[PDB]
From Swiss-Prot, chains A, B:
Family label: Belongs to the NAD kinase family.
GO biological process: NAD metabolic process; NADP biosynthetic process
Record's keyword annotation contains Transferase: yes
UniProt entry tagged with the keyword NADP: yes
Gene: NADK
Species this protein is from: Thermotoga maritima (strain ATCC 43589 / DSM 3109 / JCM 10099 / NBRC 100826 / MSB8)
Protein's cellular compartments: Cytoplasm
Enzyme class: transferase
Cross-referenced NCBIfam families: PRK14075.1
Protein name in UniProt: NAD kinase
Disulfide bonds: none
Domain of life assignment: Bacteria
A molecular function (GO) term: NAD binding
Length: 256, 256
């Protein structure tokens, strides 16, 4: 089997450990930094790092290419195995014994071009800026209006990241929905809106504000159009994998 | 009476028509921007603009000098009359028909010097930055810790501005309290802490983050000490002024 391995900056030596273990049963076709630009094609990509790293690897992957993350940094939702479980991984792999999750991107269109996000996209005022009138227009519906700092549009994957910090729901990654969350609105409108993932969303602001795509500044705009992409990443999970163990351990939600 | 007039940047025109009207019975001894530098002494300061303007004007008023704000529009917490109400005001002025109100400032010491605020002080990460560890140490106690975008420390006056956008309570302006609100913390700690106005608060962040004073950005700091100042502004109100009408009208809270 043909495997690429991608690792986070200071985890190279970890990557090397994994490479040698995996080399006993499979051909490792590529080994490099999740940073380096370039398309990666393999029957499978191993990522050493965290959700951040997996995110960057997901954008490098040939559309289709299953991936697997080894927790190197901390606990996240996009990592499947710890390093002490490497032999378990080799055993699951042997028989291809995994649950496969599909995580789909969103596509963002604006004057800045076309962006892709696995978590979310954010429009927000400058720190020195006054609040802004923001118009949210779902599908063919009339508009919702907010006077706010900004708005975050999230995928199920991204529901547990920034959107959760401002009051959004925990969305299970299988849900077929998008999530819209005003940032610090007036008139106490601190509730998110959940729409079907087949609806598109136009966001307009009264003046240009900052756009962040998966948390990276990218420029200022008055207008974006967001929808579900057909691009998606595939995440391999061990059969026991339990997302709800992660909601407890990492988010601190629902502990006994 | 010897009267100074201060207007917001754009409102030179409302200032001018307030200025001609006031001069028919009184003497305008000073006429200029509320953002311009210098202490202002008079029998009365008339301020045209909004809460933002009064806020900047309160900093210029000689300890003592009573103030009265005029708003272009809908009534605000720090203004007392609308720009059509010059009739009633000059009436009240002539008869000194006023409710006298006093609001203290807070004192912020840090790396950057010593600041005054009538509303609040905010520590907050860059748009591009990760979340930060924040330590809050009230007066004598042990510390409260958050992983967050930042924290807002507010007076009763400032409770209705940025703190309320992010979950804080509405605090009536006569309460002898300070309010501490974290901005978007993890583990769902979106609740403010209310402490007596005679307690100091120290805030420490894992790295330098932005400091805003009364919504004006002031630079980067890692440590602040906040306490109640002895300084205060006095604000003249017509006897019919009701703060709760404003909570309903401007905030949107509690309409029938």
């Amino acid at each position: 089997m043909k495997i690429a391995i991608l690792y986070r900056e200071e985890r190279e030596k970890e990557g090397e450990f994994l490479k040698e273990k995996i080399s006993k049963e499979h051909e490792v076709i590529e080994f490099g930094e999740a940073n380096a630009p370039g398309r990666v094609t393999a029957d499978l990509i191993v990522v050493v790092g965290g959700d951040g790293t997996v995110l960057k690897a997901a954008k490098k992957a040939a559309d289709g290419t299953p991936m697997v993350g080894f927790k190197a940094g901390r606990l996240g939702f996009l990592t499947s195995y710890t390093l002490d479980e490497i032999d378990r991984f080799l055993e699951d792999l042997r028989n291809w014994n995994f649950r496969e999750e599909t995580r789909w991107f969103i596509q963002i269109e604006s004057e800045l071009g076309n962006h892709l996000a696995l978590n979310d996209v954010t429009l927000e005022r400058d720190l020195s800026g006054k609040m802004v009138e923001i118009e949210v227009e779902v599908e063919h519906h009339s508009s919702m209006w907010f006077f706010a700092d900004g708005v975050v549009i999230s995928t199920p994957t991204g529901s547990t990241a920034y959107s959760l910090s401002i009051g959004g729901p925990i969305i299970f990654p299988e849900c077929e929905v998008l999530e819209i969350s005003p940032i610090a609105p007036q008139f106490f409108l601190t509730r998110s809106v959940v729409i079907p993932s087949n609806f598109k969303v136009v966001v307009e602001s009264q003046r240009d504000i900052n756009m962040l795509v998966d948390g990276v500044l990218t420029g200022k705009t008055k207008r974006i159009e967001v929808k579900k992409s057909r691009r998606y990443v595939r995440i391999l999970r061990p059969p026991e994998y339990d997302y709800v163990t992660v909601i407890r351990d990492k988010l601190g939600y629902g502990r006994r």
